[PDB]
Design a protein around this ligand. Structure first.
Ligand SMILES: *[C@@H]1O[C@H](CO)[C@@H](O)[C@H](O)[C@H]1NC(C)=O
Lengths: 49, 46
């Protein structure tokens, strides 16, 4: 465990990067996390899809 | 992988036996668990 220290005068590459990995687990349970869903305006007296 | 719950309360003034009447059950919550269930035990306040 060696020290991980920084100064603002450090160049590119020595500039720290905050990294988040959004890994996931699937295929072992019913789906519970989904994305947003589109919503539109309803229409009356016209046969629509 | 879903745990269905239904509940219904009847206000009937019968003493001991199960009432002889018809009443439906409405669904409360259909929640996912994905885990097998094999044993059952209840809890009462003391
Ligand atoms: C439920 O039972 C199945 C039967 O093979 C087993 O494969 C699975 O691991 C069990 N899951 C749990 C959460 O007990």
């Amino acid at each position: 465990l060696q020290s991980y220290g920084f100064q603002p005068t450090n160049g590119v590459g020595y500039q720290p990067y905050r990294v988040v990995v959004l890994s996931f687990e699937l295929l072992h349970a019913p789906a519970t996390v989904c994305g947003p869903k589109k919503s539109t305006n309803l229409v009356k007296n016209k046969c629509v899809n | 992988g879903y745990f269905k719950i239904y509940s219904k309360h009847t206000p009937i003034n019968l003493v001991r036996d199960l009432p002889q009447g018809f009443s439906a059950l409405e669904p409360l919550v259909d929640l996912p668990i994905g885990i097998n269930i094999t044993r059952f035990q209840t809890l009462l306040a003391l």
